[PDB]
């Protein structure tokens, strides 16, 4: 899976940079993911694996990868044709459990993304709400 090998390289190249990650790098990763759309399942697994394994400082970068991929795919293939949001939604509870192990000052950045996802209907509201509830429950 050459296209996946190229995606894996871009995603892991996040390790070669101190956050915040540039738009230029996020674009590169996103472009690689889209070119690898035949193996969208392996792309999703690689992103989820990255989020499970990375240092606290790369949690929000990991979430930005999901955001950037999903929005680019919706734009490029059509909102109802996008394969990425539905696939990312399968393990999304586990993904956010992992994301919420970010530094304290990064929690608001996760909520910001969740609110935008709701506002712009990137994910179904039924999916997003428990993710928000988890954020608030952590603050108590």
């Amino acid at each position: 899976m050459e296209a996946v090998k190229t995606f894996n390289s871009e995603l892991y190249s996040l390790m070669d940079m101190k956050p915040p990650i540039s738009k230029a790098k996020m674009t590169q990763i996103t472009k690689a993911a889209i070119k690898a759309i035949k193996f969208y399942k392996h792309v999703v697994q690689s992103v989820e694996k990255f989020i499970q394994k990375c240092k606290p400082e790369y949690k929000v970068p990991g979430l930005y990868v999901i955001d950037s991929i999903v929005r680019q795919s919706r734009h490029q293939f059509g909102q109802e044709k996008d394969v990425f949001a539905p696939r990312f939604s399968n393990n999304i509870i586990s993904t956010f459990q992992n994301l919420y192990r970010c530094p304290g000052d990064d929690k608001s950045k996760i909520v910001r993304v969740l609110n935008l996802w709701q506002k712009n209907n990137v994910f179904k509201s039924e999916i997003i709400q428990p993710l928000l509830d988890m954020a608030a429950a952590l603050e108590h």
Partner: peptide, 9 residues
């Protein structure tokens, strides 16, 4: 410029 989740695709 750093990535913003508000920025267009």
């Amino acid at each position: 410029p750093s990535y913003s989740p508000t920025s267009p695709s």
